[PDB]
C-alpha cells in the first residue's frame, strides 16, 4: 500500500482550527 497518515494529520489540522476559534473567543471575552 501507499503511506497514508492523512487521518492523523487531518485530525491535527482540525484540532488547530478548534484552538484558533477558542483563542479568538478568549481574546473577545478580554476585549468585551
Amino acid at each position: 500500500e501507499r503511506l497514508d497518515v492523512g487521518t492523523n494529520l487531518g485530525n491535527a489540522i482540525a484540532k488547530l482550527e478548534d484552538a484558533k476559534e477558542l483563542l479568538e473567543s478568549s481574546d473577545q471575552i478580554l476585549r468585551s
Partner: protein, 42 residues
C-alpha cells in the same frame, strides 16, 4: 474591577480549552510520525 475579575476567569477558562485542543493536535502529529516510521520499517 469585580467585572474585570469575572471576565479574566472566563477568558482563562477559554484559553485553557484552546491549549487542550493544541495538545491533542500535538498527539495527532506524533501518531502521524509514528505511522511514517512504521511504514518505512515494515
Amino acid at each position: 474591577n469585580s467585572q474585570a475579575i469575572d471576565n479574566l476567569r472566563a477568558s482563562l477558562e477559554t484559553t485553557n480549552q484552546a491549549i487542550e485542543a493544541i495538545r491533542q493536535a500535538g498527539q495527532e502529529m506524533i501518531l502521524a510520525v509514528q505511522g511514517v516510521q512504521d511504514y518505512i520499517n515494515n
